[PDB]
Design a protein around this ligand. Structure first.
Ligand code: OGA
Ligand code: MG
Ligand code: NI
Ligand code: ZN
Length: 331
């Protein structure tokens, strides 16, 4: 078995190896990368996502989210308060303000210590989930707006033709902006490219150990657990590395820097935070190996997680028993 200790693997494809996305994913899995839940891909030195970022300030963040925390430093939830629209130029200036900027620090480890010590006492503003792409249309390799669609994968593997589309999303972050513990919708893959700015630290639980994270989460968030059988789908819960270590949960951590890709694998729980002003682009995708994870994915039926038009069809085809009760949550 390759990668038996489920370590995060880092890949350095050549420009020749960067031509065939699907084949490269299958390569990485042949080396055991999926066992970690997360992998890093450093693009060939010749590759670029676009020529410059000089003209992005006029993108609109229509609903910036203020991430308000409750709990204790190592075990907290966050609620997203909607703010007034602002441009990316306005958001960058805010991120750089004395109130919101990254503190002085020695290295990524000291900054990580400061994040876990101090996150709950601040409410950073996250520009999340903005439909769009920053890849130049002439970028042919690993262009997250040109990937094969999940609906076409389901058709190729299973023969069934379904409605829905699959498009990327932009994330504009600042110091302390946080992504809660989650797997992807329908336990899909994700791919995430850090276009610019400061790093993003990731934490991940190997897929084979995901249920250990879930059991700890039910103990740490007991009222949420009683309310919903898949409450991590709400994407509000945070648990620190120290707490995970105290409870014996297997995990790994890695920091992504600008110019690098991360891939999350089916049923790889992940969480993390941004070090400062940055912009990431991410999209879900599928492979043949995903299908069985999609059939088994948990779902929120309390109604809080409230998810996409395209997820309807996935549920309808892969989980026809759940269909009914799940669309009651989504209607
Ligand atoms: O970058 C972020 O805030 C969150 N991204 C993801 O969870 C992802 O790419 O799967
Ligand atoms: Mg612009
Ligand atoms: Ni994710
Ligand atoms: Zn729910």
């Amino acid at each position: 078995a390759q990668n038996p200790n489920c370590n995060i693997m880092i890949f350095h494809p050549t420009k020749e190896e960067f031509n065939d996305f699907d084949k490269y994913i299958a390569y990485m899995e042949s080396q055991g990368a999926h066992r970690a839940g997360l992998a890093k891909i450093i693009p060939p030195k010749e590759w670029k996502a676009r020529e410059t970022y000089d003209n992005i300030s006029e993108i609109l963040i229509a609903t910036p989210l203020q991430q308000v925390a409750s709990g204790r430093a190592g075990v907290f939830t966050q609620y997203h308060k909607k703010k007034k629209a602002m441009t990316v130029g306005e958001y960058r200036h805010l991120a750089n303000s004395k109130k919101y900027q990254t503190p002085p620090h020695q290295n990524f480890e000291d900054l990580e210590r400061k994040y876990w010590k101090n996150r709950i006492y601040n409410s950073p503003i996250y520009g999340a989930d903005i439909s769009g792409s920053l890849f130049d249309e002439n970028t042919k390799q690993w262009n997250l707006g040109h990937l094969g669609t999940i609906q076409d994968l389901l058709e190729k593997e299973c023969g069934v033709v379904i409605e829905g589309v699959n498009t990327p999303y932009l994330y504009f972050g600042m110091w302390k902006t946080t992504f809660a513990w989650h797997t992807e919708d329908m336990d899909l893959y994700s791919i995430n490219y850090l276009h610019l700015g400061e790093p993003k630290t990731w934490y991940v639980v190997p897929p084979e150990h995901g249920q250990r994270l879930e059991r700890l989460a039910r103990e740490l968030f007991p009222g949420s657990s009683r309310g919903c059988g898949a409450f991590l789908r709400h994407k509000v819960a945070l648990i620190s590395p120290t707490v995970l270590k105290e409870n014996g949960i297997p995990f790994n951590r890695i920091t992504q820097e600008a110019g690098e890709f991360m891939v999350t694998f089916p049923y790889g729980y992940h969480a993390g935070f941004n070090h400062g002003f940055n912009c990431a682009e991410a999209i879900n995708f599928a492979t043949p190996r995903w299908i069985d994870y999609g059939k088994m994915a948990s779902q929120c039926s309390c109604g809080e997680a409230r998810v996409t038009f395209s997820m309807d069809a996935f549920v309808r085809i892969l989980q026809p028993e759940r269909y009914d009760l799940w669309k009651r949550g989504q209607d």
